[PDB]
Design an enzyme around this catalytic site. Sequence first.
Site, PDB file in Angstrom:
ATOM      1  N   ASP A 124       1.220  -1.207  -0.464  1.00 14.79           N
ATOM      2  CA  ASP A 124      -0.250   0.034   0.185  1.00 14.79           C
ATOM      3  C   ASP A 124       0.767   1.396   0.289  1.00 14.79           C
ATOM      4  O   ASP A 124       0.717   2.676   0.646  1.00 14.79           O
ATOM      5  CB  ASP A 124      -1.305   0.050   1.416  1.00 14.79           C
ATOM      6  CG  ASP A 124      -1.975   0.611   1.109  1.00 14.79           C
ATOM      7  OD1 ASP A 124      -2.609   1.152  -0.223  1.00 14.79           O
ATOM      8  OD2 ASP A 124      -2.848   0.934   1.720  1.00 14.79           O
ATOM      9  N   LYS A 126       1.789   4.297  -0.908  1.00 16.64           N
ATOM     10  CA  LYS A 126       0.969   5.688  -1.804  1.00 16.64           C
ATOM     11  C   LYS A 126       2.100   7.002  -1.286  1.00 16.64           C
ATOM     12  O   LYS A 126       1.614   6.688   0.254  1.00 16.64           O
ATOM     13  CB  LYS A 126      -0.106   5.032  -2.203  1.00 16.64           C
ATOM     14  CG  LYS A 126      -0.913   5.156  -1.100  1.00 16.64           C
ATOM     15  CD  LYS A 126      -2.573   5.196  -1.304  1.00 16.64           C
ATOM     16  CE  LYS A 126      -3.125   4.593   0.108  1.00 16.64           C
ATOM     17  NZ  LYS A 126      -4.900   3.776  -0.393  1.00 16.64           N
ATOM     18  N   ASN A 129       0.029   7.207   2.459  1.00  8.70           N
ATOM     19  CA  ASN A 129       0.964   6.484   3.805  1.00  8.70           C
ATOM     20  C   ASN A 129       2.257   7.139   3.682  1.00  8.70           C
ATOM     21  O   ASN A 129       3.392   6.526   4.515  1.00  8.70           O
ATOM     22  CB  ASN A 129       0.565   4.962   2.884  1.00  8.70           C
ATOM     23  CG  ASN A 129      -0.752   4.830   2.738  1.00  8.70           C
ATOM     24  OD1 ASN A 129      -1.518   4.998   3.842  1.00  8.70           O
ATOM     25  ND2 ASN A 129      -1.060   3.617   2.460  1.00  8.70           N
ATOM     26  N   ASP A 146       0.694   3.046   8.184  1.00  9.99           N
ATOM     27  CA  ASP A 146      -0.379   1.798   8.050  1.00  9.99           C
ATOM     28  C   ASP A 146       0.210   0.657   7.068  1.00  9.99           C
ATOM     29  O   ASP A 146       0.559   0.588   6.161  1.00  9.99           O
ATOM     30  CB  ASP A 146      -1.351   2.900   6.549  1.00  9.99           C
ATOM     31  CG  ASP A 146      -2.258   2.758   6.548  1.00  9.99           C
ATOM     32  OD1 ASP A 146      -2.519   1.643   7.358  1.00  9.99           O
ATOM     33  OD2 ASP A 146      -3.450   3.021   6.011  1.00  9.99           O
ATOM     34  N   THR A 163      -3.937   0.938  -4.116  1.00  9.97           N
ATOM     35  CA  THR A 163      -4.776   1.857  -4.937  1.00  9.97           C
ATOM     36  C   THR A 163      -3.888   1.907  -6.625  1.00  9.97           C
ATOM     37  O   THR A 163      -3.150   1.298  -6.510  1.00  9.97           O
ATOM     38  CB  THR A 163      -4.503   3.463  -4.607  1.00  9.97           C
ATOM     39  OG1 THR A 163      -5.177   3.583  -3.158  1.00  9.97           O
ATOM     40  CG2 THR A 163      -4.982   4.239  -5.655  1.00  9.97           C
TER      41      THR A 163
END
Length: 258
Positions: A124, A126, A129, A146, A163
């Site tokens: 994750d 991105k 984060n 995260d 995402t």
Amino acid sequence: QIPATITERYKVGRTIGDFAVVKECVERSTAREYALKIIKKSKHMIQNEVSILRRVKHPNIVLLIEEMDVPTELYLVMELVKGGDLFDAITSTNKYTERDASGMLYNLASAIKYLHSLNIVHRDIKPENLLVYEHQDGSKSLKLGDFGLATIVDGPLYTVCGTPTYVAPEIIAETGYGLKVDIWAAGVITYILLCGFPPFRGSQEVLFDQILMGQVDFPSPYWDNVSDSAKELITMMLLVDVDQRFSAVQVLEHPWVN
Ligand SMILES: COc1cc(N2CCN(C)CC2)ccc1Nc1ncc2c(n1)N(C)c1ccccc1C(=O)N2C
């Protein structure tokens, strides 16, 4: 609805991030600011993230200080990064210099290298984060947080997550993936830092087919002043071939990050 141990030692403030909520707080004894993350419980995904957060201690990863568990929620006292997330910073600034973007990639690649040395894939990575850290020097670092989607790679993974803008093509193909999906996400982010738009933008099937093709272009005039060294590094991070795609070690060895 917060336990006495937390309120006894922390003054809980405004919500700064909204599965879970993150709040600002002040440690009463020192007046130093911290973050309180509150995860609501149902009547295994929380157990996994805390087990990861317990093992990860790195200057470019958001630190977990302590846990207070009650039946209805889990309270995590965590490091507060006062800069804010990278997503908000990219919205305000449009794009970065190569010196700033390269230093930020050095921080991200350091955290990823540490995670991959533990066989942890983030899944994750991105701008939402990543957190921008304000130094005494005025220089700014990045911290990765995260770990709700993080897991240990003991074989190929197949669950689709993340995402789509940052998702690696092997995840979309559902043929099996490992640690190097983090490198691809870092490559997409670096590309955004240097020009302000993603390398794969789509129109939702258009975006996936473009990622699967993995044709990275450096359009004019946006990339005309960007060095060939940066374009080579981004290209090596965004290779569809998982074997040729750079590891975090290879990213850190590249001249553009040095
Ligand atoms: C002043 O600090 C912030 C301001 C904003 N906002 C955003 C809204 N704008 C209107 C004002 C400025 C945001 C954040 C932070 N900080 C921060 N420090 C530590 C985090 C975290 N966010 N949260 C929210 C996280 C976010 C992503 C990943 C990990 C974390 C995580 O686990 N922790 C523990």
